[PDB]
């Protein structure tokens, strides 16, 4: 609706070279607006939490040891069984 | 290296700015978010890709994305 | 760290008519004596679109569990087609196994299964009224995506939930 809700974080060339790495050989041009809700939902996870570490410890700032922390509270998927 | 900094780095701050006023992000704390960002985005296009190849397409659709977050066992 | 965790999955019947019940043998580790029950559900996914179209397909209601190697087969009932959007039907979809402890979900496999009339003619002309009885099921069983979630089993996180 208002400029604020749309500023995005990754450029349309930048999805096209996300998307070829991930061996992706064709999209449709909606792809864009669903990989940019993805990455927000992401990012808002990730942020809550490094954040939280960081009011905690009273920071003044965000470090890099409260990303890493919050990254690794994210769960992981592997590709089979035992790993 | 994959996705400019600026850009990134400004959509992070929008979201820090709801949880917490003029809370700054160190420059190591933000390349570390975009690394994990790309790689995450990346893996979740392997995904998206096998359930298109699955399908028998070549064209992934946002359906594929919303399927391999299902099935990468995103909490919803 | 894992109390409980999933050794391998065995995909019995594949390909198969939509109308099939699903057949499973699933293989799991048990360390140590638990307290409470092991629940695996079968979801099969109704619509990318929303969790509103989940169908519980199955479960499976463990306690209290047996230490060691536990190795079981079981036949879970398909989706009703009446459920599932029509334009979503014969189309790709995920189908979900997972396991929780005490009712904290730890392990999730996700597997592709792709759905598709059985006849030229049907594909290429796929008719208003979806003839059920034309689909057939395949799942990417060779493709399981695993993932893992931290819970408590039975007892140091200064952060919990």
Request: aromatic fraction near 8%.
């Amino acid at each position: 609706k208002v400029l604020r809700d749309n500023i995005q974080g990754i450029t349309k060339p930048a999805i096209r070279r996300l998307a070829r790495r991930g061996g992706v050989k064709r999209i449709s041009g909606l792809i864009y607006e669903e990989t940019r809700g993805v990455l927000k939902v992401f990012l808002e996870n990730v942020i809550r939490d490094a954040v939280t570490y960081t009011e905690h410890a009273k920071r003044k700032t965000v470090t890099a040891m409260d990303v890493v922390y919050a990254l690794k509270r994210q769960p992981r998927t592997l590709y089979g069984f035992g790993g | 290296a994959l996705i400019r900094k600026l850009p990134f780095q400004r959509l992070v701050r929008e979201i820090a700015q709801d949880f917490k006023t003029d809370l700054r992000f160190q420059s190591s704390a933000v390349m570390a978010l975009q690394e994990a960002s790309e790689a995450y985005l990346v893996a979740l296009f392997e995904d998206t890709n096998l359930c298109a190849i699955h399908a028998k397409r070549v064209t992934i659709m946002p359906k594929d994305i919303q399927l391999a977050r299902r099935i990468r066992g995103e909490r919803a | 760290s894992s109390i409980v965790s999933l050794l391998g999955i065995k995909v019995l019947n594949n390909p198969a008519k939509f109308t099939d019940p699903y057949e499973f043998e699933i293989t799991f580790e048990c360390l140590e004596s638990l307290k409470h029950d092991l629940e695996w559900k079968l979801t099969y996914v109704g619509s990318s679109r929303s969790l509103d179209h989940d169908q519980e397909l199955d479960s499976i209601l463990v306690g209290p569990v047996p230490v060691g190697v536990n190795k079981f087969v079981f036949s879970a009932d398909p989706p009703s087609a009446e459920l599932i959007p029509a334009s979503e039907l014969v189309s790709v979809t995920v189908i979900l196994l997972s396991c929780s402890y005490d009712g904290r979900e730890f392990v999730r496999v996700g597997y592709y299964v792709n759905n598709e009339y059985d006849e030229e003619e049907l594909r290429e002309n796929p008719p208003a009224k979806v003839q059920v009885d034309h689909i057939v099921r395949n799942i990417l069983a060779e493709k399981p995506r695993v993932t893992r979630f931290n819970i408590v089993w039975d007892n140091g996180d200064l952060y919990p939930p």
